């Protein structure tokens, strides 16, 4: 067993290098030539807030077992993940690093690293995917606390102590670092924003939200305090080991990749725990645009299967909003979910309604009887209030997916509404501008209906359609229904 | 004295009508022909929330004196305001309607209405403006509670009881209805949103804010509950009369059209009262774009004088943010403010800092050291994050004035920032894309400076300028000094 600085990086990495003239992105979907240039312990900037660079935690923190799974990872990136852990963490807090080789083409990628101090390697004899691989790692772990990292990460100064501090104080917290960006083209390490929380739209794809002005203001007195998050990104977190077991590890029937992050985030919050992001903890990650590995048969389908297994167990009736956003998912078989359902009963978990009200209230939820919801899209433009109020006109701007002035619903009462304002046909003459007015369920001037395969909006009882041809020179108008592009409108969710 | 239904509207309105072929907007800056077609008690839609319409309102409440000032108002609109009051209010809660004629060309506009039940008319023998006219009304009022309305309003069903209920319970509350819109072109009555609060930017012009999602969510259990507001619109409110007197009425040296809404909003909050908007109370108002009457000083100048008189008395050091937004105001003389200052002392009022923290915390305060702020404009386009985060590119979209992804600052550290992200020159080679990264004062790659009369942005220590030529095919770039940008 070799102390990390004595490990021969050139011997390990050299041999798998990008050959003369070949594409440096093909193998990993990031620039391997640029990754291979880097020293295994290369210096990276300290991206932590000023206050971190002196703050503290307790003096007897529990040690962790670090679990890293990989499938055909670049040697330089894997080695660098491992040495960033050994170099930036106090030695007495690292029990071991468990490398789970998830059936990589070449078993030596992992096995050679078993020589390094504290490194244990476990090879799957067939392809299992990240969820079953992580669980194999967790099951072999000796320490009280688990840490999971992707196999292309780089830990920053004092990344670990702030995470451990939290779970040592309360074992029901599941905590993550702020995840810095390692650029997939040049491999520069870039400090991420600290003003983000995790979230998602009704398609159940993970996304980053800025905190609200109210949240930011409440933190002014301690800007590096933990941030409660509705959802974690999923690959980098720290969790009490026994808590991970009690809560049901991961769903063993999810395959390859995607959205075990979704499942575990719902399960923790609904079943009594919490999720946090810890600003003083910084870890870089190579974000990429495409997967470099295979999905039996097809990433689209696997992601939908996994997502369905989460939705059908945890979301109660609100799963129907997911299927409204992704109707093709209804045709994807997802297998037996019984033991996951029995797990939910056994833990006494709160309903998803509770999660929405108390954990993710800023996720905008359609009324139970809404016909459609979300943005109203025309090409790359969206229906927009233009910041106007009652008696004001309405327009378009480029879709920004931030909601706000581009958020609308088609109600049970057949009205197109934003807040308590409704699109109102004030004058039936073609070319007349429409106005925003307070919604009046009786008012027939506010009634609209989808037509032509939910591609347009017609004013009920007329041959008038919503039309953008006047948008920049007065506002949206009512015009005789006809084949123009300016009369095409689609909602992002359709019930 | 005549009951309102017996009043001869055609006789009153019918001499003063828009003559054949003449401009129907000239006299009032709204469509008089369309106003004159309407019956004095014309039906209007009930715009109240469902819950309001089921409530049975208390009627064992203090009566009010309604004060309405006017200067050359259209007869049809003034009559209609008066009858909406008499028709929609329980008779025992109307003590009187005091019409303050602020030196209208024709005194008969007001005097002919003195025949109507409960109407008293007071004529100013010279032009005094709305603030002094309202005070004259208040001074003459016999009831315990004052109600002020503009002379072109229309009260809706059970508009009054919900307002009186609040001040009867606590006399330090100053309360307003939701103000519906009477369209200045067609005179249709239109229901306003109930999700607004009053506010202002540092230029001290009144504006409407939507409540936050959080505020709206807290009210889900009682959606017609009072809404606390940092500021009232100013023309429609109800206030305990003795409270109005003790707090100092209005500043008698403000002229014409103020400013006075700002002053009284600050004074009430800082000096121990509150401001509310009451959803179950609905009153329509003819909003217009221009004033139809004369301003001796301004209008630009009188508005600034009045606003000064408020700022200098109430805002402490924060007045300097007003002057930073409206530097021309520093040259406007505003007269003696001594008795207003003595009033503030006498009442033991809290400082403006308290008001910002406790009443209007959402007003963004440039506690500095910012060099510039707002949108970064190029033609009709604006600098836009494109919803991107750290290590992402940056671009342009059409300016929308909604802030969000088009909001930026130029800091004391000379960085161009959105939230805690900064425009970063990642590569000095001309044509290189710039990226968003976490702000570090250090990173000399993040430093920018305005040049050529604040018309461009140059990267400090280089001959590189910010450039949009690549915007739609990669993002904003750095290029040798599409390079025009203004905050």
């Amino acid at each position: 067993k070799v102390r990390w600085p004595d490990f021969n990086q050139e011997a390990y990495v050299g041999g798998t290098m990008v050959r003369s003239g070949q594409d440096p992105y093909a193998r990993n979907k990031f620039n391997q030539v640029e990754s291979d240039k880097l020293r295994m312990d290369r210096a990276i900037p300290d991206t932590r807030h000023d206050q971190c660079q002196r703050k503290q935690w307790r003096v007897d923190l529990p040690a962790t077992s670090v679990v890293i799974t990989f499938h055909n990872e670049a040697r330089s990136a894997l080695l660098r993940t491992v040495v960033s852990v050994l170099k930036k963490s106090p030695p007495h807090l690292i029990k071991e690093i468990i490398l789970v080789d998830d059936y990589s083409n070449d078993p030596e990628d992992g096995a050679l690293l078993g020589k390094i101090e504290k490194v244990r390697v476990l090879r799957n004899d067939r392809r299992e995917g990240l969820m079953r691989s992580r669980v194999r790692g967790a099951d072999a772990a000796q320490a009280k606390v688990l840490t999971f990292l992707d196999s292309h990460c780089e830990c920053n100064e004092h990344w670990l102590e702030p995470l451990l501090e939290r779970v040592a104080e309360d074992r029901t917290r599941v905590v993550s670092p702020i995840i810095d960006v390692i650029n997939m083209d040049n491999f520069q390490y870039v400090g991420a924003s600290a003003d983000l929380k995790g979230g998602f739209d009704w398609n159940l794809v993970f996304k980053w939200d800025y905190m609200t002005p109210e949240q930011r203001r409440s933190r002014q007195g301690n800007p590096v305090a933990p941030i409660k998050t509705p959802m974690i990104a999923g690959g980098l977190f720290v969790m009490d080991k026994f808590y991970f077991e009690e809560l049901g590890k991961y769903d063993m029937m999810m395959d390859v990749w995607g959205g075990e992050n979704l499942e575990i985030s719902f399960r923790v919050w609904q079943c009594g725990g919490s999720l946090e992001i810890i600003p003083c903890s910084r870890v870089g990650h190579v974000f990429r645009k495409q997967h470099p590995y295979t999905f039996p048969g097809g990433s689209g389908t696997v992601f939908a299967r996994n997502t369905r297994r989460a939705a059908e167990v945890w979301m109660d009736e609100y799963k129907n909003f997911y299927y409204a956003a992704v109707p093709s998912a209804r045709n994807v078989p997802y297998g037996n979910i019984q033991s996951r359902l029995e797990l939910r009963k056994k833990l006494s978990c709160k309903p998803f309604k509770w999660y929405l009200e108390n954990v993710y209230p800023e996720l905008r939820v359609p009324d139970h009887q809404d016909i459609a919801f979300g943005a109203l899209q025309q090409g790359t433009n969206c229906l927009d209030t233009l910041g106007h109020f009652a008696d004001g006109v309405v327009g378009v701007y480029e879709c920004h997916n931030a909601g706000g002035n581009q958020e609308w619903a088609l109600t049970k009462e057949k009205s197109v509404k934003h807040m308590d304002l409704c699109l109102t046909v004030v004058d039936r003459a073609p070319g007349s501008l429409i106005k925003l007015q307070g919604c009046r369920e009786d008012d027939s001037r506010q009634k609209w209906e989808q037509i032509e395969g939910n591609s347009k909006l017609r004013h009920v009882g007329s041959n008038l359609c919503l039309d953008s041809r006047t948008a920049k020179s007065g506002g949206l108008s009512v015009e005789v229904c006809g084949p123009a592009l300016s009369q095409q409108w689609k909602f992002t969710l359709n019930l | 004295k005549v009951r309102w239904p017996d009043f001869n509207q055609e006789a009153y309105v019918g001499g003063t009508m828009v003559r054949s072929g003449q401009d129907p907007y000239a006299r009032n800056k709204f469509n008089q022909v369309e106003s004159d077609k309407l019956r004095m008690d014309r039906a209007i839609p009930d715009t109240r929330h469902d819950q309001c319409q089921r409530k049975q309102w208390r009627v064992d409440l203090p009566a009010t004196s309604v004060v309405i000032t006017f200067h050359n108002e259209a007869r049809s609109a003034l009559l209609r305001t008066v009858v909406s009051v008499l028709k929609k209010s329980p008779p025992h809660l109307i003590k009187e309607i005091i019409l303050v004629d602020d030196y209208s060309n024709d005194p008969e506009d007001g005097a002919l209405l003195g025949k109507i039940e409960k109407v008293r008319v007071l004529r100013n023998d010279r032009r005094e403006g709305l603030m002094r006219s309202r005070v004259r009304g208040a001074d003459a009022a016999q009831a315990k509670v004052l109600t002020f309305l503009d002379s072109h309003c229309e009260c809706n069903e059970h508009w009054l009881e919900p307002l009186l209920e609040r001040v009867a319970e606590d006399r330090t509350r100053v309360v307003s209805p939701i103000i519906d819109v009477i369209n200045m072109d067609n005179f249709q009555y239109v229901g306003a949103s109930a999700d607004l609060k009053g506010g202002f930017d540092w230029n001290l012009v009144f504006k409407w804010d939507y409540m936050t999602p959080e505020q709206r969510r807290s009210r889900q259990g009682n959606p017609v509950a009072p809404i606390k507001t940092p500021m009232i619109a100013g023309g429609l409110f109800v206030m305990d009369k003795f409270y109005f007197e003790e707090l100092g009425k209005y500043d008698m040296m403000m002229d014409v059209w103020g400013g006075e809404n700002l002053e009284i909003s600050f004074r009430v909050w800082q000096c121990g009262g509150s401001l509310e908007i009451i959803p179950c109370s609905r009153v329509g108002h003819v909003f217009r774009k221009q004033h139809p009457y004369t301003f001796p000083g301004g209008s630009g100048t009188v508005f600034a004088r009045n606003t000064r008189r408020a700022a200098e008395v109430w805002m402490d050091e924060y007045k300097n943010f007003y002057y930073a937004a409206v530097p021309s105001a520093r040259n406007v003389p505003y007269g003696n403010i001594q008795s207003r200052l003595e009033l503030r002392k006498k009442l033991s009022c809290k400082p403006f800092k308290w008001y910002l923290e406790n009443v209007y915390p959402e007003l963004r305060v440039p506690d500095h050291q910012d060099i510039a702020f707002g949108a970064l404009q190029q033609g009709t386009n604006c600098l836009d994050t494109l919803g991107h985060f750290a290590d992402g590119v940056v671009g342009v979209y059409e300016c929308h004035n909604a802030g969000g992804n088009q909001e930026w600052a130029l800091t004391k550290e000379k960085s161009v920032k959105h939230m805690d992200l900064c425009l970063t020159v990642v590569d000095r080679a001309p044509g290189s894309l710039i990226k968003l990264q976490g702000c570090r004062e250090d990173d000399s790659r993040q430093k920018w400076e305005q040049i050529e009369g604040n018309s461009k942005l140059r990267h400090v220590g280089s001959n590189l300028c910010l450039d949009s030529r690549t915007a739609k095919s990669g993002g904003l770039s750095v290029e040798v000094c599409s390079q025009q940008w203004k905050f």
């Binding site: 995840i179 810095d180 983000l196 999923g234 645009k289 | 750290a390």
Partner: peptide, 7 residues
């Protein structure tokens, strides 16, 4: 389909 996106 597509990976975990960038902060």
């Amino acid at each position: 389909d597509s990976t975990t996106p960038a902060p």
